[PDB]
């Protein structure tokens, strides 16, 4: 089955003050609805209550290539198509599982030749409300593996397809 499409390209946003017209270059929006992932040090006690909030929606770096290459504060919350990218971010103690519409497909938007194209990123302008955060798995730092008996579902997750 194909995915439902919301009319609002930032329907998912935790911070709706994000300014879609300030995004550069012109974004190529993700139209698939597979699970995405985010390595984050922040704990589920916080993420499940707040969602993923972006560092700066008003004065942050709205330029995608600038944000990818130099992680200045931005209106974006980064995620990945790649379940296993947490192995590269071993320091972050969690691999979050996300089921959210939309997002800017970084490689479709700025190409797949830049330094970080292997990150297969999707950038959420305005972040990601908790209802789109499936859950989380803690990461064992020494083996770069998920502690699967310690995964936790987000009580606020609301399936939508």
Residue numbers in the entry: 40 to 200
Q: How does the study describe this entry?
A:
S. scabies produces a 200-residue, 22-kDa protein that is a single-domain enzyme called Scabin. Scabin targets DNA as a substrate for ADP-ribose modification; it also shows enzyme specificity towards genomic DNA from Solanum tuberosum tubers. Scabin shares nearly 40% sequence identity with the Pierisin family of mARTs.
Scabin active-site residues proposed to interact with the ds-DNA substrate include Val109, Asn110, Gln111, Thr127, Trp128, Tyr129, Trp155, and Gln158 (DNA I strand); and Gln100, Asp102, Glu104, Ser105, Leu108, Tyr129, Lys130, Lys180, Lys181, and Arg183 (DNA II strand). The α2 residues, Leu108, and Val109 showed importance for both catalytic activities, with the former being more important for GH activity while the latter was more important for ADP-ribosyltransferase activity. The rest of the Scabin variants showed either a WT-like crystal structure or similar CD spectra to the WT in solution. All the structures were of high quality, ranging from 1.5 to 1.75 Å.
